[PDB]
Design a protein around this ligand. Structure first.
Ligand SMILES: *[C@@H]1O[C@H](CO)[C@@H](O[C@@H]2O[C@H](CO)[C@@H](O)[C@H](O)[C@H]2NC(C)=O)[C@H](O)[C@H]1NC(C)=O
Lengths: 50, 50
């Protein structure tokens, strides 16, 4: 006779993007002024996710 | 700058409309009832409440 079975292979994932400053320093301006002196942190996280 | 899709950030500030529920205690000593009290004092029987 002829038997049959099926298999699944995963080829992708959901594409998560993160606003780094709104995750860290949501809306308050003192937090944004403090986060500016860390420099290239949010840009490195955005670059890796891109 | 180069050609591309850039994720530029937005802005909003909301200082309006504080609502402030704050669980009131025992309400008042009710001197708005005592200055308007039905027993009106005299100088001879002047009334003091602490
Ligand atoms: C105004 O003050 C008088 C007393 O200064 C209050 O009269 C008292 O009323 C309660 C209940 O009706 C009685 O148990 C007391 O004995 C009363 N006091 C006296 C001296 O008789 C009156 O209730 C107050 N009224 C308002 C609207 O605050």
């Amino acid at each position: 006779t002829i038997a049959g079975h099926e298999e699944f292979i995963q080829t992708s994932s959901p594409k998560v993007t993160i606003d780094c400053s709104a995750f860290v320093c949501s809306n308050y301006a003192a937090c944004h002024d403090l986060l500016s002196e860390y420099g290239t942190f949010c840009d490195n996280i955005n670059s890796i996710l891109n | 700058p180069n050609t591309g899709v850039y994720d530029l950030s937005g802005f909003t500030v909301k200082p309006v409309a504080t609502v402030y529920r704050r669980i009131p205690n025992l309400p008042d000593c009710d001197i708005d009832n005592w200055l308007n009290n039905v027993s009106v004092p005299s100088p001879l029987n002047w009334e003091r409440r602490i």
